[PDB]
């Protein structure tokens, strides 16, 4: 009857809602996890790039000064 | 009263189902973006490894020429 239909509908509404909320929480946990991973890999490769630039400048300074002192010593 | 309760349940169901439809679209969008981010990050990771490969190669090639001179 009418009371029965309303009760049944409320049971469904609550169950479906709580189910959806459980899934939404899992998906937000997943999303923050992925953001964490993305951050870690991005910053790691940022570091690798800074470190490469450091060792690049050290080797460019070491090699591009040997050629200049040869420019002087090939004139002698 | 029965009519009011029924009408409220209609609203609850419609609004809920609408919100769920939107949430699904937004989760599809989120996974899509994650896919893109991953693809670009890994592509530039590979470009960086390959740059380091070719750098060691050229450094070794110019070093051995400088040393034999």
């Amino acid at each position: 009857v009418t009371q029965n239909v309303l009760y049944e509908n409320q049971k469904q509404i609550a169950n479906q809602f709580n189910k959806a909320i459980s899934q939404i929480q899992e998906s937000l946990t997943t999303t923050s996890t992925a953001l964490g991973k993305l951050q870690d890999v991005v910053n790691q490769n940022a570091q690798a790039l800074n470190t490469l630039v450091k060792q690049l400048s050290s080797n460019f300074g070491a090699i591009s000064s040997v050629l200049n002192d040869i420019l002087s010593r090939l004139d002698k | 009263t029965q009519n009011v309760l029924y009408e409220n349940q209609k609203q609850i169901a419609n609004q809920f189902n609408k919100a769920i439809s939107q949430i699904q679209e937004s989760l599809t969008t989120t996974s899509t973006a994650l896919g893109k981010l991953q693809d670009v990050v890994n592509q530039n990771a590979q470009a960086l490894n390959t740059l380091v490969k070719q750098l060691s190669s050229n450094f070794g090639a110019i070093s051995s020429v400088l040393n034999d001179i």
Binding site: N9 | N17, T28, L34, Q38, V41, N49
Partner: peptide, 29 residues
Amino acid sequence: INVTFLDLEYEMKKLEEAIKKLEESYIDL
């Protein structure tokens, strides 16, 4: 120098699952 790779395929799978289980949560009144 260490570069690293990203693999969030598991995460994306878990999202696809979430979306598919939200399809089961609609209300047939």
